Every structure is written in structure tokens, then in C-alpha cells.
């Protein structure tokens, strides 16, 4: 059982030790496309790269590279794209990926400025009347509406493929209160955020995989996917205490390196899942 395991690690203060076992056992696959010199400026961080086997490919012919990985959770029937926060020069690639992969939601878990540095380009419009045009990928993006809440903001966006003149509606879920340092004191607002994403239909299989990102696409982004998949497996399985968070994390790390960047984040993910188990083991 998982609450038990949490108690044992916390009383022992051995989160750092558990976290290292995961690092040592984590997969390593080649990242050759990402390290090509032609792609050095498509990567925000030199030590965070997509494996070649799970990388998302753009349908461009000159350069198909974007720092983005497809995570396929086959038992849970969930797929996610994890990516870095766009760079000033990759905003057009980012929306091209969203278009090509038929995604319906974008989950953003960082602020554009954190700790006094820029963690992400401003890649969506801020006013209805000032749309954005990505000339390189021939896409137009318009803010349709914006619902600001205390812990998160939901935006409706219209993405128009200027070449074909087709349009789709994208939902942008922006969690705005992740603290600059550490992790949230309680998982309550995180879980409420996660269930709003679920309720929107963005995680469902009639759509392309949801795009999740922070700054590197591995820390907070990993916490989000890990919690969603764990909670889904608890629904599906005959034995809900047969779900091992550590096993699930290692399976996801076959698809992108480094998911969950700190022992604090690991602790927090346990907390989110354990608390979330209450509201899906039958609390209407
Ligand atoms: Mg206005």
C-alpha cells in the first residue's frame, strides 16, 4: 500500500535516498537528433533532451526537430506530449506541433517570469484584438476569452491554419501559483486544476495528446502526468493499492529523461495521488 510507504519514508526523512534509487534505475536512450549543432538553438537547456525514439517530429522537411517527447501510458490509455517552454524562435514550431498532433489542450505549469529570469516566451495573445501570426509555420492564433481564477487561468484560443483556412479551438490551462521555490504546501489546488483539465475533454482519446509544459518539461510537467496516470490506474484496476508510484515513474522515464526533478517533487506527487484517491474511491 502507498499511504504506508509514504509514512515510512517521511518519518525516516529518506526522500533523498528513494529519489536516488529512481535516478540510478532510470533508462538512458540516445538523444542524437537533439545534439546536432543545427538544433542547438531549439533547446532551452543543454542537459534536457528528448530521446530519439519518443521525440515528436514536425512535418517540416528542412528541420523536423522540437524538444518534445510523446509519453504513451498503455495500461492507462493516456498519452501526453511533454515539451519545454517555447523559446522566442520556437513559438511557431510549438503551435505547429499542436496543430499536427491534433491536441485540444495546452497545460502550462510555470509563469513567464520566475526568479527574475524568463522561463518561457509569451506564446499566446494577451488581448482579443491583438492576434498573433507565426509567419514561419503559417499559423494565426487569437485569444477568444480568458477566465482568471485564484490558482489558475483558462483561456480559449482559436488556431487557424492559414494555408488550409481551417480553424480549431484550443484550451490553455495555466497553473499560476506554483511557488518559485519548492512545491505547493498542499495538493488541493493542484488536484482541482488537474480535474478541470480532465473535465474539459482535453485528456480524452478522441483528441490528440495534451501538450504539457513548464520551463524544462520534466519537473512540474512530470508531477502532472504522474499524478493523472496513477489516479487513472486506481480507477481501472481491481486492486487500487497495486499501483506503485515508483514503477509508474520509471515507465514514464523511458519516454523522457528526468521526470520529477527533486525529492520534494517526488514527495509532493505521493501526496497528490494519496489525497486524490479519496475523491475517486467514491466521494461524489
Ligand atoms: Mg481589453
Residue numbers in the entry: 2 to 285
Describing publication, verbatim:
Protein tyrosine phosphatase 1B (PTP1B) is a negative regulator of leptin signaling in the hypothalamus, where it dephosphorylates the active site of leptin receptor–associated Janus kinase 2 and decreases signal transducer and activator of transcription 3 (STAT3) phosphorylation and transcription of the anorectic neuropeptide, pro-opiomelanocortin (POMC). As such, there has been substantial interest in the development of PTP1B inhibitors for the treatment of obesity. Focusing on the variants in and near the ordered catalytic domain, we ascribed structural mechanisms to their functional effects using in vitro enzyme activity assays, room-temperature X-ray crystallography, and local hydrogen–deuterium exchange mass spectrometry. By combining these complementary structural biology experiments for multiple variants, we characterize an inherent allosteric network in PTP1B that differs from previously reported allosteric inhibitor–driven mechanisms mediated by catalytic loop motions.
Some of these variants are located near known allosteric sites: for example, D245G and Q78R are adjacent to the conformationally bistable loop 16, which is known to be allosterically linked to the bistable, dynamic, catalytically essential WPD loop in the active site. The locations of others, such as I19V in the α2′ helix and P302Q in the Pro-rich region immediately C-terminal to the allosteric α7 helix, do not correlate with previously known allosteric mechanisms for PTP1B, indicating that further biophysical investigations would be needed. Compared with WT, D245G and Q78R significantly decreased catalysis in vitro, consistent with them having the most extensive LOF effects in cells. Somewhat surprisingly, I19V also decreased catalysis in vitro, despite having no statistically significant effects in cells. These mutations decrease kcat but do not change Km, consistent with allosteric effects from their locations distal from the active site. The mutations were evident in 2Fo–Fc and Fo–Fc electron density maps for D245G and I19V. For I19V, IADDAT difference features span the mutation site, central β sheet, and active-site P loop. Indeed, the pockets near I19V, Q78R, and D245G are bindable by dozens of small-molecule fragments as well as small-molecule buffer components that became fortuitously ordered in crystals.
